[PDB]
Amino acid sequence: VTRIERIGAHSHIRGLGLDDALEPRQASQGMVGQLAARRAAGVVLEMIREGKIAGRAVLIAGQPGTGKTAIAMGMAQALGPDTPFTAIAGSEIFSLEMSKTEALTQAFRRSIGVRIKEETEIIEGEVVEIQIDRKVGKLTLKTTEMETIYDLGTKMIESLTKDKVQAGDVITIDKATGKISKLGRSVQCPDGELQKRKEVVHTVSLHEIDVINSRTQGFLALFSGDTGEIKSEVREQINAKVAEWREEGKAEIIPGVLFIDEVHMLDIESFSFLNRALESDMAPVLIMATNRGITRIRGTSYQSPHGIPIDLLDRLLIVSTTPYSEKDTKQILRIRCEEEDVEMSEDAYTVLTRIGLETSLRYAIQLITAASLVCRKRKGTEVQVDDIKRVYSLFLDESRSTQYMKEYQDA
Amino acid sequence: RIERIGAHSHIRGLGLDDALEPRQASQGMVGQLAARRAAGVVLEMIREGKIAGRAVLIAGQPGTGKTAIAMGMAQALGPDTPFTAIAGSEIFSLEMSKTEALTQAFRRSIGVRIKEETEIIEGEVVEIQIDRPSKVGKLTLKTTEMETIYDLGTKMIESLTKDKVQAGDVITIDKATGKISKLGRSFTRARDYDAMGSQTKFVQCPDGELQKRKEVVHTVSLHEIDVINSRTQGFLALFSGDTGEIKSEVREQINAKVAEWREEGKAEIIPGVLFIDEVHMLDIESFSFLNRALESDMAPVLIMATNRGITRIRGTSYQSPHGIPIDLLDRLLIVSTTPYSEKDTKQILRIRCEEEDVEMSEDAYTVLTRIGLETSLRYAIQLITAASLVCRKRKGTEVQVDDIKRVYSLFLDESRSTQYMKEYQDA
Amino acid sequence: IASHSHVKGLGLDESGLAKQAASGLVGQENAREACGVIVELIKSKKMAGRAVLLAGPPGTGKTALALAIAQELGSKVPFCPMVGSEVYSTEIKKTEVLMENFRRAIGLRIKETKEVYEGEVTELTPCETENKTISHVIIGLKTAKGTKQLKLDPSIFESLQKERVEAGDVIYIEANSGAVKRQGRCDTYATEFDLEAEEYVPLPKGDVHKKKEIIQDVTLHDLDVANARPQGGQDILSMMGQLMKPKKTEITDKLRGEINKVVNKYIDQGIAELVPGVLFVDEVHMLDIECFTYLHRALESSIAPIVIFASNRGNCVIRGTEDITSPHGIPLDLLDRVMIIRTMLYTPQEMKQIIKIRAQTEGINISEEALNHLGEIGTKTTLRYSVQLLTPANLLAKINGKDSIEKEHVEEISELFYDAKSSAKILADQQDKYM
Amino acid sequence: TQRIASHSHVKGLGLDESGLAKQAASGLVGQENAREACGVIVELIKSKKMAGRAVLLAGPPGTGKTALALAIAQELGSKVPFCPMVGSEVYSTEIKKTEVLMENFRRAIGLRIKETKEVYEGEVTELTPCETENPMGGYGKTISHVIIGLKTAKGTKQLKLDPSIFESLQKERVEAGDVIYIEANSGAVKRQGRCDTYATEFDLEAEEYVPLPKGDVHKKKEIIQDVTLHDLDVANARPQGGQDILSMMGQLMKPKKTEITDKLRGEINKVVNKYIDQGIAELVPGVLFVDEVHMLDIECFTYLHRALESSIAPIVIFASNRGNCVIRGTEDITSPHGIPLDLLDRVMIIRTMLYTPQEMKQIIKIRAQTEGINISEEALNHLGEIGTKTTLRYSVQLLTPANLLAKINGKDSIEKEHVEEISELFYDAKSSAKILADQQ
Amino acid sequence: SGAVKRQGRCDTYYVPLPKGDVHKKKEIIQDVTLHDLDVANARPQGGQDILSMMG
Amino acid sequence: ITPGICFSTASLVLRATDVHPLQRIDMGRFDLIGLEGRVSRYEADTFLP
Amino acid sequence: QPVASPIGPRSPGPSHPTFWTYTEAAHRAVLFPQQRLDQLSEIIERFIFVMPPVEAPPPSLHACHPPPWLAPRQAAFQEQLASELWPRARPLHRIV
Amino acid sequence: GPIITYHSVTVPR
Ligand SMILES: Nc1ncnc2c1ncn2[C@@H]1O[C@H](COP(=O)(O)OP(=O)(O)O)[C@@H](O)[C@H]1O
Ligand SMILES: Nc1ncnc2c1ncn2[C@@H]1O[C@H](COP(=O)(O)OP(=O)(O)O)[C@@H](O)[C@H]1O
Ligand SMILES: Nc1ncnc2c1ncn2[C@@H]1O[C@H](COP(=O)(O)OP(=O)(O)O)[C@@H](O)[C@H]1O
Ligand SMILES: Nc1ncnc2c1ncn2[C@@H]1O[C@H](COP(=O)(O)OP(=O)(O)O)[C@@H](O)[C@H]1O
């Protein structure tokens, strides 16, 4: 019934809703209005897909709630799988097992894929019989269309000893490794050919190459037990070896995206690092998002636009997203209602639109679900205006909450 | 044997009656009636133990018996109830966070006691015989009332051999585990002593039944269970405070297991005390943690002491009484100690030199009380021993006024030192 | 033993409206029925990353309400209490503490079948073969209902040797785990020697080889940790859980990747049920600006739990900024992402009946004159202080031979102990003496 | 012999039997009042009765605070522990500040433990058992004793042990003609190797062909070992041993190493009390000396409240240098000596005075005497005169370079010309400060 | 070095039979740096004793 | 016990990125660290010359 | 080897100085990890009950068309480890 | 085989 992923803040964003002239539909693929910024996102999305130009930087700026993280998720969903999209917050680089500069380069290099195309051949069938002469033996395998004998040589019989003493299992044997994997007790047995040549297109980030080759069993990319790779040596020769895979047929590189949400949280050490990390061939596109105005940069006393130093703002293109009118607000609320299970009166939509246009958009989006539940209490089936008024009284927004501080409490 | 008399050795506990009525100078504590009575009330609530996470702040001037009252509570409470004393600056570890340090301080003052009856054989060995083969043998044991004989299995023969025990040893066998422990040599354990061997470590042999059932109690602190379950090393519990215990299914898991043991009666929970001295040293993060650490059912009572009043809180620029936020200050009952009357000062000095085993003349008491009333009580307590040494160097019998005057000239008291600091040294 | 015990539910009707005094809560009607909406939001399992801020002065029940939510939900869903101060770790990234606490607020109830071999082992033989290590060990087992024989792995032989088993003694094997226990000698052998180091136990019953279905429940965090720092059982990588074993910044590649994949794979083949729960970050007002800014990305994730924040401050400086100040001590950017529930400051009558509920929770008899006096103390000082006077007054009652609190009892107790408000004037009058 | 350092000349507080100072007793000159004061605290140490008592040596730099602080160490002798630390050693990467303080606190409490052990050794020549009447039914070969003959360079003696030693002896696999070790009370047999009289002549073997023991076959002596409580603590925290895989924390060095009260108190004070009340060991409570105490943090100063109020504490000598000064770790809290008033309430303050010219001539003379310099009375007077203008320490330090100039110039002693020359080659603090004030 | 690396099983029974001469000889003229040398000298290799755990 | 223990999958050449037989240099002429437990002051200073 | 400990290094015998400098009573107080396990055994038997609610084999397997030498070397290394210090883990078996 | 016996006995104690 309920899987891991459930209804979140950006679930309705199925893509960046553009015509293929990179022209935004006023409402499509879950995205509403925000035309100039969305079409700018379209241009940079096609620039991502082209891939020929390295280390480009886009800042998407605007008030809180004006669709900028929504635009970033729209780019991620429009780009689809099998092109890296590494999404982090600026707060992620502040770490205790590695320095902020090193975490930032690691983020850069999770964001470049290497696409490597490999042919193996895979056996898949139901075990009919197996033998042991204490050592040599034989194995008979069955697909619904054929059966055969195989000779169990030393490595194969050793491998099959790992989970033995059962038959009728439907299993796969990789002729490269001898890696046995069993689907279960004959779940149905397989169709077609027993043994087939098979192709896999692995896409592996540069961070994964770097980590796998850092150490014996260095493939702990699963738990971040690396603490700063040996740059200029175990990282320069991986760049060289990938450049050797390329222009020969072994591999092709897939330059992805690094989305740094809330980049105002980086500090001037980190920004100074970005300056040069953006200038190499293996630099992905990074796009980054910021609410803040002209504010103090972290780590110093300097005021700057977006809280980003000016010598890095020189290095990027600044999309501006703009606040929403009544019509766009109403349409966003409708799409949120359609992503959730709720239905509302048109008068309820009107009241909620004015509520959200008064205080803030995100508060109204939150009220949707609360009003749905409130109507469910009285065993209604469509959210009415008095549901919204009740919920508006139960749950305050920041402005009215601040106004209610006409009594006193700690500081 | 040698735990030299420190600043607080004289107070053997709160000098209260059966009705929590503080006496003037009984049981080593002097004066300070109101605060001592309050300490008695909260000590009785520690003993009753049915309320968790209640909190007391002993406030007052520097020198007015706050730490004396705290150690009086520690001494009156006695063993078998955890009293964990910690300075507020002890929780700033490099190995673990402030809040893990505070959790461990809290948990170290809750005890879990598992009480179990077990049957033992206790006896003087009259003979042991054992053959090499699956080796096999016999053991004969005596108590003043009887003797009996046991055939021994292989594991028992092994464990007996592992201790090299022999005739005349007086031993116990735990029938459940079979570990031998010779309490000593019976008066029939004398060696032939035709040549040198073991010394004459003689002790009496046992009385009554040879096999008997007796109670054993295994008491461990909650921090102790927690540590030894944390990771398979576990001798952490002695090694060092090297921790960072995983909250996930160790706090809740220990709490649920100990609650189940409490409910089914396998274990008794014995909540103790956590005393944080100089609590003003805690960080606003630390006070914030205490807020919700108190609001728990495995929380001991914690007592706190502080010398300072209206001053900024550590880690911020917020003014507040006692240097504690009025957030945590609202979870507390505050006990304020008062400054001492001249007679209370004289009587503290009298008890204190009685503890230090030095005689003084009544004029010496008079002048020393004057000193410790113009300057500070701790200084008058420090002059006792210094004047005693000056006295003994002249082979005197008791401390006289001239001894105290001499040693007063010899050492300064931070008032005279600041007065003499009119030389601009390294300002 | 008590502390916040009195409260055991939100005290709401079938209409989800506050009953004014029920289930241990005796005020806060608007706030409690708002929490009713929140518990319904949690039990629907439909949403992710929705966040609530309980905001109001100290002692106004914003933790009573948050824990009463945990009771309204029951013990079946995860409720993870956390203090903001807990993010400042030495061994792990500050933002990592937070993102793992999100993971243990999501539960997973999953059913397992594990196979057991048990009984008196009547015979053993290692299968010797040339490689020249042992191949297997053959075993025979007996129970009060039958007998069988089997072949077992060299690792299981190794653990049988760690245990030092012998022919004719009782064992248990859980073959999926591979774990073994020597449970003693059989009761029948207790006559064999007059003294032994053994423990004797009656023979096991039921089948010598058995199976049963066990409905475990875990959290996503437990799966994460299990794969980041494996116990593993059947390996010598205890050497990694040793001379190292700290906390690690385990990462998206498995946390948002592999673990999510295998948990969905369990869910949509019927083996498991996901149970989203609550993360209750109490004292949120003193997270770092880095932590607040990370909670943006955390509340916007499609897998996150419901997060309840409790805050206590006015408008004050956000920790880690040193310049910018904001309401509740929370930046406006995160304050835009939460639904705010006010908690009111109590009137004298509500406060008085809190005193009564508290008194009867820990078995205190109090006369109504003394109860009214504690009400007066409460409005003069604060609710929590006059509530705290109850137990000391009961102790003085016992000492005076009474069975209940009376007027002069609370007078004596309220004289020995001072509140924060009443101690400040002592510290202000004699300013240059306390330091 | 060993190199001359700043304080090599102080050999004691210089106190006669009434506890006064004549003028310059045992390498210290002047400071009679201060030397009398810590003469009292020396006897406070020797009486072993008090715990956690503390004294603060306060005065301007160069007024002998360190000098007489360690003259106390000379008065106490090497028997008691005197543990010096500077106020800057508390800041550490591996371990919390207050834990350094605790380590140093019980690094200053000694425990000297006396134990006789008695031993038999020699080339073993006889190894014959002694049969006896059958204890039980007729098995025969009942061994009641075993005779063993040991040879040393003194004589050959035969010895009877009970049969358990026969078993241990065989399990140790000793042979006739090798050299063993027997520990009478414990009962161990240890094979220390075949006797060298059966020499390695063409044997290359590494097992020790140990020489025939000198002295008697039987020898006993009272071993007398002094350990600090901190040594016991550390040895229990990270122990040695070739087993118990935790002991193979051997590649790793030892961070995280803050010791625990459960061990510190619960497991280690009991054994010390037992040895003391048994007649095996004596506690030797010593001194912890903390100079430049002004460098400690406010957290450290507050920890010292608890630490100094313990029953299990040494006596602590603090030395401080600063005036009324900001306490480290505070936001502009100013207090005397850089030490919080709260801790100053707990220390007896000894005031050290600033020297007169006469006293400085005496100290200069003693330092010249100690460094091995011969100095003319004219050069001594000139050193005194230039040392009245600047600090004593500079005046003293000019001696050795001036003596090197004298030696280069062929002179056997410092003529006034050389101190004049050195006083222009090198500057003091004040002269250099004036140079810096002139040029930008 | 005397270093042995097993490249696989021969093709006929897996890796192709090497197509050159059996005794390959070449002048490697490739260059290194001082830091690479320092790093290679910082820690030991092999040993099979306690050193195994340093691996 | 979860058989859902994950297994990472990669390409052959990825796992073979840092190997080369006849294009790598011999570092055995530079490794001082490898001498200390195994070579003697006398051997290098006195015998070999 | 025990450079600054209360307990002495190995001594060949009473013929050499450091036999007569270290008391046995000081040796009885360092309580090597063996007696730590022994004296804790009574509470190890009772108070150690915590398990992780889920358990998985080593952090991952790593499948591919690997270098042929790559697998023999890891297996040999694990043989070389588990052969040496697994007996040393036997004392910890009661806790584990 | 070898049935070597150890006794220790409380003789006249
Ligand atoms: N153009 C848009 N189309 C659809 N949804 C939007 C759009 N703009 C904002 N939203 C929604 O409104 C809410 C505001 O979040 P968001 O715009 O991501 O904040 P910010 O712009 O500060 O990153 C989210 O629920 C988001 O999905
Ligand atoms: N009520 C008391 N009874 C006995 N001795 C006291 C009392 N109050 C203070 N003292 C003595 O005075 C000294 C100061 O007391 P202390 O508790 O350290 O003060 P505080 O801790 O409040 O600064 C102690 O060393 C103690 O010996
Ligand atoms: N509505 C209520 N009904 C019953 N008891 C209450 C109520 N509100 C508060 N209390 C009691 O008063 C205390 C103060 O409330 P609390 O939740 O601690 O507020 P805060 O968390 O802001 O300090 C609680 O611990 C609880 O014992
Ligand atoms: N009373 C004294 N007798 C002899 N030499 C002294 C005396 N006082 C100081 N000195 C010498 O002068 C130096 C300065 O004294 P010292 O105690 O080191 O300075 P501080 O007081 O700053 O620690 C010492 O190193 C010592 O050589």
Rounded CA separation B336/B356 (Å): 28
Please tell me the number of the ligand nearest to residue D60's CA: 4
Three-class SS of residue C352? helix
Give the resolution to one decimal, in Å. 3.2
Q: Are D37 and D301 in contact (CB under 8 A)?
A: no
Helices A385-394 & A361-377 angle (0-180, nearest 10): 110
- Is B58 a pocket residue for ligand 2 (Cβ < 6 Å)? no
Nearest CA in chain D to G91: D244
**Chain G environment of F1 (Cβ under 8 Å):** 54-56
Rounded CA separation B199/D117 (Å): 12
Query: What are H's interface residues with B at a Cβ cutoff of 8 A?
Result: 1-10, 13
Within 10 angstroms of residue B224's Cβ, the number of other Cβ atoms is 20
Which of D65, D393, D396 best tests ligand 4's pocket when mutated (most atoms within 8 Å of CB)?
D393
CA angle C411-C414-C415, nearest 5°?
85
- The DSSP symbol for C281 reads E
CATH domain B6-110+221-340 topology: Rossmann fold (3.40.50)
Q: Which residues contact D372 (CB under 8 A, 6 or more apart)?
A: D4
C260 has a chain A CB within 8 A of its CB: yes
- The per-residue DSSP string of A70-137 comes to HHHHHHHHHH-SSS-EEEEEGGGG--SSS-HHHHHHHHHHHSEEEEEEEEEEEEEEEEEEE--B--BE
Q: Which atom of ligand 2 is nearest to the CA of B29?
A: 3
Q: Are C208 and C148 in contact (CB under 8 A)?
A: yes
B73: CA distance to ligand 2 center in Å? 13
How far apart are the CA of G63 and the nearest CA of chain C, in angstroms? Answer: 15
- Is B380 a pocket residue for ligand 2 (Cβ < 6 Å)? no
Q: Note whether G80 contacts E52, CB cutoff 8 Å.
A: yes
Alpha-carbon distances, residue A308 vs A68, A271, A303, D154 (angstroms): 17, 7, 9, 90
Q: Are A134 and C129 in contact (CB under 8 A)?
A: yes
Q: Note whether E55 contacts A230, CB cutoff 8 Å.
A: no
Tokens of B180: 């031998």
Tokens of E54: 């340093």
Q: Determine what percent of chain G falls in helix, strand and coil, rounding each to the nearest 5.
A: 50, 5, 50
Give the amino acid at G45.
E
Q: Are C38 and C306 in contact (CB under 8 A)?
A: yes
Do the two domains B6-110+221-340 and B341-427 of this chain adopt the same fold?
no
- From first CA to last CA, the distance across chain G in angstroms is 31
C413: CA distance to ligand 2 center in Å? 24
**Residue B342 burial by Cβ neighbours in a 10 Å radius (0-12, 13-18, 19+):** exposed
Rounded CA separation C345/C357 (Å): 18
B193 has a chain D CB within 8 A of its CB: no
- The per-residue DSSP string of A299-311 comes to TSS-EEETTS-HH
Rounded CA separation C27/A353 (Å): 33
CATH of domain B341-427: 1.10.8.60
C209 has a chain A CB within 8 A of its CB: no
CATH of domain C346-429: 1.10.8.60
Nearest CA in chain F to A203: F10
Q: Are B91 and B102 in contact (CB under 8 A)?
A: yes
Q: Note whether B234 contacts G95, CB cutoff 8 Å.
A: yes
Experimental technique used? cryo-EM
**Domain range annotation of chain D:** 1-107+236-354, 108-235, 355-438
Q: Which residues pair with B312 in a beta bridge?
A: B319
Q: Assign domain D1-107+236-354 one CATH number from 3.20.20.80, 3.40.720.10, 3.40.50.300, 3.40.640.10.
A: 3.40.50.300
Measured over the CA atoms of residue B303, residue B308, residue B309 and residue B311, the dihedral's sign is negative
Please tell me the number of the ligand nearest to residue D71's CA: 4
What's the CATH architecture for C1-104+227-345?
A: 3-Layer(aba) Sandwich (3.40)
Q: Note whether C238 contacts G96, CB cutoff 8 Å.
A: yes
CA angle A241-A246-A248, nearest 5°?
105
B69: CA distance to ligand 2 center in Å? 8
B426: CA distance to ligand 4 center in Å? 17
Closest CA to A259 of A295, A290, A226: A290
**Which residues have C-beta atoms less than 6 Å from ligand 3?**
C 4, 6-7, 24-28, 58-64, 312, 354, 357, 383-384
Please report the residues numbered 372 through 411 in chain B whose beta carbons come closer than 8 angstroms to any beta carbon of chain C.
none
Alpha-carbon distances, residue B142 vs B124, B129, B163, C197 (angstroms): 5, 15, 19, 20
Q: Does the annotation place A65 within a ligand binding site?
A: yes
**Domain range annotation of chain A:** 8-112+205-324, 325-411
Nearest CA in chain E to A177: E14
C411 has a chain B CB within 8 A of its CB: no
- The DSSP symbol for A170 reads E
For chain H, the farthest-separated pair of C-alpha atoms sits apart, in whole angstroms, at 35
Rounded CA separation B132/B283 (Å): 68
B421 has a chain D CB within 8 A of its CB: yes
Residue D385, H or E segment: helix D377-389
Within 10 angstroms of residue C164's Cβ, the number of other Cβ atoms is 9
In this complex, the chains that touch C, judged by 3 or more CB pairs closer than 8 A, are A, B, D, F, G
Q: Are B203 and B170 in contact (CB under 8 A)?
A: yes
Alpha-carbon distances, residue A161 vs A130, A153, A180, C135 (angstroms): 11, 12, 10, 10
Tokens of B71: 């150690």
Within 10 angstroms of residue G80's Cβ, the number of other Cβ atoms is 13
CATH of domain C105-226: 2.40.50.360
Rounded CA separation A306/A61 (Å): 8
Q: Are B277 and B70 in contact (CB under 8 A)?
A: yes
Looking at C168-283, list the stretches that DSSP marks H as alpha helix, in order from N- to C-terminal side.
220-228, 252, 259-267
Please tell me the number of the ligand nearest to residue D321's CA: 4
Looking at B49-189, list the stretches that DSSP marks H as alpha helix, in order from N- to C-terminal side.
66-77, 98-107, 154-163
Give the amino acid at B380.
A
Give the up-direction half-sphere exposure of residue C385: CA atoms within 13 A in the CB hemisphere.
27
- How many whole angstroms from its chain centre is CA C268? 28
Rounded CA separation D406/D165 (Å): 74
CATH domain A8-112+205-324 topology: Rossmann fold (3.40.50)
Tokens of C205: 């019953």
Rounded CA separation C122/C148 (Å): 10
CATH domain D355-438 topology: Helicase, Ruva Protein; domain 3 (1.10.8)
Alpha-carbon distances, residue C286 vs A291, C85, C289, C332, D153 (angstroms): 22, 7, 9, 15, 80
**Chain D environment of G29 (Cβ under 8 Å):** 232, 235-236, 268, 271
Q: Does the annotation place B321 within a ligand binding site?
A: no
Q: Are D68 and D13 in contact (CB under 8 A)?
A: yes
CATH of domain A325-411: 1.10.8.60
Cross-chain CB nearest to C327 (options A97, A405, A407): A405
Tokens of B258: 């100990």
- How many whole angstroms from its chain centre is CA A358? 33
What's the CATH architecture for D108-235?
A: Beta Barrel (2.40)
* Strands B319-320 vs B311-312: parallel, antiparallel or unpaired: antiparallel
Nearest residue (CA) to ligand 3, atom 3: C25
Three-class SS of residue B119? strand
Q: Are B127 and H7 in contact (CB under 8 A)?
A: yes
